[PDB]
Each structure stands twice: as structure tokens, then as C-alpha cells.
Write a protein that binds this DNA or RNA. Structure first.
Ligand code: MG
Ligand code: MG
Ligand code: MG
Ligand code: MG
Ligand code: MG
Ligand code: MG
Ligand code: MG
Ligand code: MG
Ligand code: MG
Ligand code: MG
Ligand code: MG
Length: 127
RNA sequence: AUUUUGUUGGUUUCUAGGACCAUCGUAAUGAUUAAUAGGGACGGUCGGGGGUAUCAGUAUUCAGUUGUCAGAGGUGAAAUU
């Protein structure tokens, strides 16, 4: 039927990565980040930039032959926050609305079975 | 050592007295509860109680292979990087 890639979307709170690989993930097809679409650091992770980033990925996917993708959304993970950034929701909707077909969707955020120490100190970040 | 042998040392038998030792007989012969105190034993347990080894788990960082290409990071915004 369709030809599947894998859209590995890494959505932090400072930027948004839209990265499409092959099934193995060892071959990169298109990687457009929200920071390549704006010149202000404060909105590298904006929903608007993520939508533009996804459209460039979808356009690149079409000329290589990728007609469908599986979605593996992730947050920063590790010792830091596990909730996805604001751009992850926009990049997913933009991909679906760009004529690309959507397969399986999974959250693959790095979660610890314990945890190393997290930055900020004992008293947290005082603002 | 309490008396007397006419009498003082007497003298050790003697008399009597505790104090014990044995036998026999008397006797209803002789040991308070087990504290909704405690201690101990025992029986099935119950615990992220302790110690010594041992086996996971992803994560973090670093490294090796790869893959593409212009930003990535970070913030309230930036900059150092
Ligand atoms: Mg940023
Ligand atoms: Mg830029
Ligand atoms: Mg610049
Ligand atoms: Mg540090
Ligand atoms: Mg405050
Ligand atoms: Mg006389
Ligand atoms: Mg008792
Ligand atoms: Mg026992
Ligand atoms: Mg996992
Ligand atoms: Mg520059
Ligand atoms: Mg950035």
C-alpha cells in the first residue's frame, strides 16, 4: 500500500525538531527544526514555527517518495520535564493536513527507572 | 564449776548442767497466688527492620559506527557556549 517513514518529533520548550527517518531510523530523510523558520529565540518552539517546520518536512518527503509516516513524539525526558513542548501538537496536525498519511502514534519520551540528580539545586530555581 | 571430806593447794572418779551427736515415737510433718506486672520456651505468621553477596531497569554523560544539513543550546528576553 503506502510507503512508510518514521517522523521522530522531539518537542522541547526551547525548540521543535521534526525529523523523518526510514523504518530503521538509521537513514535520515528530512530534518527541519522550528529554529530554521524564525529568527527569534523566544519562539523557536512556537506552534507557528512547528507548523512551518512540518510543512517543509512533508514537502521533502513527497519528492523522495514517502507517502505515510508513523509518529514517535518525545519530550526532553531524562532528568528534566516529561511533558512535550508546545510545538509537538502543531507539527503533528500540520503533517496530517499536508496530504501525508499517518500511521501509528507513540510517545517515546526518555523516562528514568530511577534518576540521576536534576539541575537547579535543593531549593529549586528561585525567581 | 554451783556444793563436802575438821582444812589450802586438792584430784579424778564421782555426782549435776548446758552444747552437740545417734535411735525411736509424735505430726494432716514442711513449698501462698500466677498480677489483662514482667522474663523465657514453642506455632503459624508479618514487615520498604539490619548485615553480606547477587540480579534487574531505564535514565544521565561519554565513546564508537551511521544518516542527513544550519543552526543547536539557554531564558522572562538574551548572552557566555
Ligand atoms: Mg530557544
Ligand atoms: Mg536562524
Ligand atoms: Mg544569526
Ligand atoms: Mg552543570
Ligand atoms: Mg517567587
Ligand atoms: Mg570446809
Ligand atoms: Mg501472669
Ligand atoms: Mg518465631
Ligand atoms: Mg522505556
Ligand atoms: Mg550564526
Ligand atoms: Mg535553541
Amino acid at each position: 500500500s503506502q510507503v512508510f517513514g518514521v517522523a521522530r518529533i522531539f518537542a522541547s520548550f526551547n525548540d521543535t525538531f521534526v525529523h523523518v527517518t526510514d523504518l530503521s531510523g538509521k537513514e535520515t530523510i528530512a530534518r527541519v527544526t522550528g529554529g530554521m523558520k524564525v529568527k527569534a529565540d523566544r519562539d523557536e518552539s512556537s506552534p507557528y514555527a512547528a507548523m512551518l517546520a512540518a510543512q517543509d518536512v512533508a514537502a521533502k518527503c513527497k519528492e523522495v517518495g514517502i507517502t505515510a509516516v508513523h509518529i514517535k513524539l518525545r519530550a526532553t525526558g531524562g532528568t528534566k520535564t516529561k511533558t512535550p513542548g508546545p510545538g509537538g501538537q502543531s507539527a503533528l496536525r500540520a503533517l496530517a493536513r499536508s496530504g501525508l498519511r499517518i500511521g501509528r502514534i507513540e510517545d517515546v519520551t526518555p523516562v528514568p527507572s530511577d534518576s540521576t540528580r536534576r539541575k537547579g539545586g535543593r531549593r529549586g530555581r528561585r525567581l
